[PDB]
Amino acid sequence: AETDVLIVGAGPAGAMSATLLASLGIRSLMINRWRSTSPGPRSHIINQRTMEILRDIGLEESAKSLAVPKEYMGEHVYATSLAGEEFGRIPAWASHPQAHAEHELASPSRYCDLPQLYFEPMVVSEAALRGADVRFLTEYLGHVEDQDGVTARLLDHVSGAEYEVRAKYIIGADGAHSLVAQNAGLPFEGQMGIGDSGSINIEFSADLSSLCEHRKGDMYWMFVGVAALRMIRPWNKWICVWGPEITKEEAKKIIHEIIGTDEIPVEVGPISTWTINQQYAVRNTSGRVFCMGDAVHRHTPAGGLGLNTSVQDAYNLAWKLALVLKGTAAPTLLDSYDAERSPVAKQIVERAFKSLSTFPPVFEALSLPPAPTESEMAEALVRLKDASEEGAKRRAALRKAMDATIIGLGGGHGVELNQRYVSRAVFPDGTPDPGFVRDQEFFYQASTRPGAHLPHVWLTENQRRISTLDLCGKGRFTLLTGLSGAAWKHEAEQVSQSLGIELKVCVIGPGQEFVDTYGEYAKISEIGESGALLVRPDMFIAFRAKDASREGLEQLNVAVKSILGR
Amino acid sequence: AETDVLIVGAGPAGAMSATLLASLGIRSLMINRWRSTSPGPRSHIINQRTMEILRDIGLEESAKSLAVPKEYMGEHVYATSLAGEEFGRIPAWASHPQAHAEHELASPSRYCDLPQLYFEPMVVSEAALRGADVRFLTEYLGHVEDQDGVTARLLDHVSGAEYEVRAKYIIGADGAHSLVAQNAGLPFEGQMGIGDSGSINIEFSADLSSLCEHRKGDMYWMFVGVAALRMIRPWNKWICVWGPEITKEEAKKIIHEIIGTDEIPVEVGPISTWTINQQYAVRNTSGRVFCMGDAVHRHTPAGGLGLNTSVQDAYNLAWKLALVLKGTAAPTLLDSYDAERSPVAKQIVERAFKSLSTFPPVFEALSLPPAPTESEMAEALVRLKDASEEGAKRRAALRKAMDATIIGLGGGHGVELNQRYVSRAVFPDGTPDPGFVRDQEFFYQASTRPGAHLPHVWLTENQRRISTLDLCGKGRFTLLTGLSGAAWKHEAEQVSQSLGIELKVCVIGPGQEFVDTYGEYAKISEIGESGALLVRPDMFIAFRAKDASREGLEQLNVAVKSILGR
Ligand SMILES: Cc1cc2nc3c(=O)[nH]c(=O)nc-3n(C[C@H](O)[C@H](O)[C@H](O)COP(=O)(O)OP(=O)(O)OC[C@H]3O[C@@H](n4cnc5c(N)ncnc54)[C@H](O)[C@@H]3O)c2cc1C
Ligand SMILES: Cc1cc2nc3c(=O)[nH]c(=O)nc-3n(C[C@H](O)[C@H](O)[C@H](O)COP(=O)(O)OP(=O)(O)OC[C@H]3O[C@@H](n4cnc5c(N)ncnc54)[C@H](O)[C@@H]3O)c2cc1C
């Protein structure tokens, strides 16, 4: 066997890598130990960035037609049981009109609810169609690196055979216990994730629309520990989660209690368990090996950043491998994979963990014990209806506590979108870092400075709305400018013919292909109309010029050659 | 390797077979020579029967959320070009209110538009998830049958290795040039399909909603030969088809002419060719080999019966192999596969071909030549606007001709649903064949007589509509009766414990789990309320009793033992 890139793993990171590589004409052989694509629903939250990437390749429309949309996952209800009395609700997943606006202004896509069970196979099938060899029931065993590529040993669970595959690079998208990471010797840190804890999940079917329809929500939390009624399909498919474990028909009981009532005909599906040693990789790259996904970041499910962050890891490295394999870019370009993705890995492991320190306070608000029994939790409901000044501080305390839990339920827009890149793959412009005017975890800050992702705004084509993001991507470099920067079209030519690289230029303005109809691009560019913003295949701005002056024009070439390593 | 059933092919028939077998707990290893699932859109029409089967397994909702629905494929427009003048339209795919009612009354599902490109992978991924081993890039080379199973030789296009797989049965779902059919020696007939002719298909993208939206249609025919603008995704994705061929950028020209105007920005995709030696197999079964799909029926694309008929071939044989492999049924049960599916194979090859003799008359109506040039076809448009009595006969002639083309565009409801089974797997009741009151190709006739598929009617559960079909299926035998046939619950028990077979009984009536709310079941059963209708896992009624009399009750056992071959 001989492939350009061996992809170990077919989950979110692997499938995406194979689809993008194929889309770029690079031969890749993605493997996966199991029969199917994952069985449980696992991850479910799809953030804007993941959507954008789905939109770039043409998989958004299908994605949206298998997901629950944003309007059905805004009611986060804290209660005793589903059929019980509530404590309160929070506007989850940017439901609050303010949060919704900030959401809508940051990108043309929007939160949706798509379980991994359906997302996986959509991407695996597309990778194959796009020309990426796929092969399940084949496990990676190890590899040996050498100066011209790698050879790896594969076990085939169908024939029982064993074989080698020669590849130029390997992508370690093999999960939480990456054998690829262990072989490459990648250092891991921040294991302080407390005491290694797991979760137990149970699937079951019931028709609980009568207790959902009027208050449509992605999840219904129960205080019972902090159990959780997560919707899989509205409102007939479910799952309970709570905090390596055996259970039986008794689970049906647990649920009947989690539903409060035992009258909706329930059908108990599979029962899994999930453990996690919270850690990141300090480095994601060793020689010709690159890891990504849970293979570089392992953490809690708070904020659902794991599947999203993993697809973004694949987006950042695909075009890069493709440019290097085609000889248009020097192998150095690959060094920025670690530079740009590694800080994202550590950032999310810590944030996902920090969010776990927001729930506990809801208990302390009900002046309760973590191991509340019944009377205790029934006496809390009483103390809460108290008509005294001390009942007010109390109710106020509980509202405060619950509202503090939003950062882990749709409130961390900054965390999802505020990616700042520093590396050879980004050509600095000379300006200083502007900062964040407001909290960088909670609110997103749009920025055209090199290192940041393009900012969304709407534009028009045939008088129909198109987003700045639609103009770019496509496995190519993008240059955006206006009418007065006409000179950018030629520069770009001279710098593309000479560098053997594709470089699409768009001159936005009146009577042009794309038009600044609402004047919003002029508003969000942070530069004259004659300036230019170079956009990488992954949507990040690496180069920014303030005008079309000879000294601004001459710099393009220096930036591209620099970004490519030549 | 060792599997219970080797499935050669992963298209519609193979994927479905693997999903159903898995669903029945039978170990199956489905293979496929290619990388992906098919690339072109190929088949696109999904008939009611295919839907029903999707609904039984739980894949209807997903299917419906990737398809164009019935309301967008009712306007069949005959024109010069898309942007030209029309000759006329026909109500395709049961759009006509009368046809729509007959459609809606025959089943709880409805025509939809889902290309094979999306349908394939939905079913392949589900088969894997359900526990069916899948493996592409593996080709079948041949096999040797022996009295206890078969051994087949496989070529692996990934490792280059060659290996054997031992299986009890093989399912030849390998297409139009089935190597499995040739090895099993299956006789083929009715090659008279005239002179072997092909079609050329071309994909392209344009935004032609401005010339579709007001007249939503599955296809736009152009008279140019009989070209055809088929929609893939409304209304940006397309394909032209017309009557082994090379073409280039010039195709873009062909289309610009097929669109009439050259102003919509067009993007030329792939260009394939499709050939077909019209033939059926006289027998579909040899020893331990069973063929299905195009491997048993090859024909034109008129009436889109091929993909539907192929899924139905898999539905008919899955439960059967499962009962035999579990030792609950004698190997003889498998003999009815040929008895019941074989006549369907010949019926559709001939019908698909006959439909090709309905188009030609539209020309003779315009008093034209098959090879019309331009002036000729422009002079036809003139002769058509003539204000004479001879212009009237003419316009009337053309309307007649076009309306005759409906049998191949949604008019053959009988053909899609009028399956009559005769075999050991059906226990006759003693009544004679009732016939069809109206044309058996055009209109469907519901019939509770053994050998026919359950008739759809609505019933209620929790006051919510459920279709008689929903009560049955599930890889099990189903007995339907009413309040006065209470005795059927016990009989069924005695006959299920003793035969080691699952047999669900439903007593439909007032205050029961299912209720004849609209009295429609009482109306369509053709028997007393005390009677019973036994339904096979494939939705076909094999046994029918007129009442709960001791002589009617005692017969159940004799029928089940007979249907199973014991
Ligand atoms: C049970 C469970 C429940 C979860 N629930 C949630 C949730 O509710 N919310 C949330 O945000 N996140 C959840 N996660 C985490 C989430 O699944 C990850 O963030 C996401 O799957 C990362 O994608 P990945 O492809 O990197 O991981 P994976 O998809 O696990 O990548 C590894 C894949 O490669 C294959 N593979 C592994 N080892 C080998 C080998 N040696 N050889 C060949 N192939 C191999 C495996 O088939 C595996 O599918 C859950 C994880 C698990 C396990
Ligand atoms: C180009 C094209 C266009 C078409 N367009 C239409 C249309 O517009 N309308 C319509 O109604 N019908 C159309 N058809 C016919 C339609 O595709 C068939 O009715 C349908 O595909 C039947 O399903 P199947 O799985 O039996 O066929 P297939 O899916 O072809 O079954 C064979 C499959 O098994 C695999 N296989 C084959 N040989 C081997 C081997 N030796 N070893 C291992 N694996 C093997 C192949 O990968 C192949 O996918 C078209 C067919 C083609 C080829």
Short mmCIF file of C-alpha atoms in Angstrom, two decimals, chain A residues 1-2 29 35-39 62 65-66 117 121-122 125 127-138 156-159 163 207 209 464, chain B residues 1-2 29 35-39 62 65-66 117 121-122 125 127-138 156-159 163 207 209 464:
data_model
loop_
_atom_site.label_atom_id
_atom_site.label_comp_id
_atom_site.label_asym_id
_atom_site.label_seq_id
_atom_site.Cartn_x
_atom_site.Cartn_y
_atom_site.Cartn_z
CA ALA A 1 0.00 0.00 0.00
CA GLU A 2 1.06 3.53 -0.77
CA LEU A 29 -6.14 6.27 3.19
CA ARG A 35 -17.34 -1.74 12.09
CA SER A 36 -19.56 1.34 12.01
CA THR A 37 -19.01 4.99 12.65
CA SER A 38 -19.63 5.66 16.26
CA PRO A 39 -22.85 4.31 17.72
CA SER A 62 -27.35 18.54 4.32
CA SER A 65 -31.53 19.03 7.19
CA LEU A 66 -30.39 16.43 9.71
CA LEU A 117 -24.34 9.30 15.19
CA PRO A 121 -21.44 8.99 8.40
CA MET A 122 -22.33 12.08 6.44
CA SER A 125 -19.37 8.98 2.90
CA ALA A 127 -14.68 11.71 1.91
CA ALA A 128 -15.02 8.46 -0.04
CA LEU A 129 -17.02 10.15 -2.79
CA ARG A 130 -14.46 12.91 -3.03
CA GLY A 131 -11.82 10.29 -3.68
CA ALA A 132 -10.44 9.37 -0.26
CA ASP A 133 -9.80 5.68 0.38
CA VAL A 134 -11.71 4.54 3.46
CA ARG A 135 -11.29 1.32 5.32
CA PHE A 136 -12.82 0.26 8.59
CA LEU A 137 -12.08 -2.84 10.60
CA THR A 138 -8.43 -2.07 10.18
CA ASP A 156 -7.20 -6.27 9.20
CA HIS A 157 -10.08 -7.53 11.26
CA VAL A 158 -11.81 -8.91 8.28
CA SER A 159 -9.18 -11.17 6.75
CA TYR A 163 0.05 -5.35 6.12
CA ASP A 207 -42.88 10.44 23.57
CA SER A 209 -43.50 16.08 23.61
CA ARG A 464 -28.94 38.41 -3.20
CA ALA B 1 -13.19 -15.12 6.93
CA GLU B 2 -16.51 -16.57 7.93
CA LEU B 29 -20.24 -9.29 5.07
CA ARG B 35 -14.15 3.41 -3.33
CA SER B 36 -17.38 5.33 -2.70
CA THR B 37 -21.01 4.52 -3.03
CA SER B 38 -22.12 5.43 -6.47
CA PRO B 39 -21.19 8.89 -7.70
CA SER B 62 -34.21 10.73 7.45
CA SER B 65 -35.33 15.11 5.11
CA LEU B 66 -32.94 14.47 2.24
CA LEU B 117 -25.99 9.66 -4.54
CA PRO B 121 -24.71 6.14 1.83
CA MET B 122 -27.64 6.55 4.17
CA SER B 125 -23.95 3.54 7.04
CA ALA B 127 -26.17 -1.44 7.79
CA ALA B 128 -22.77 -1.01 9.43
CA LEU B 129 -24.30 0.54 12.54
CA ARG B 130 -26.80 -2.26 12.77
CA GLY B 131 -23.93 -4.70 12.87
CA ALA B 132 -23.28 -5.66 9.25
CA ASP B 133 -19.64 -5.89 8.18
CA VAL B 134 -18.99 -3.59 5.22
CA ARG B 135 -15.97 -3.53 3.02
CA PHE B 136 -15.39 -1.59 -0.16
CA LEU B 137 -12.48 -1.85 -2.53
CA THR B 138 -12.90 -5.57 -2.43
CA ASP B 156 -8.54 -6.51 -2.01
CA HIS B 157 -7.75 -3.33 -3.86
CA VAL B 158 -6.19 -1.79 -0.86
CA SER B 159 -3.58 -4.35 0.14
CA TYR B 163 -8.55 -14.09 0.34
CA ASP B 207 -29.50 28.76 -10.71
CA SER B 209 -35.14 28.87 -10.13
CA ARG B 464 -53.21 9.76 17.04
#
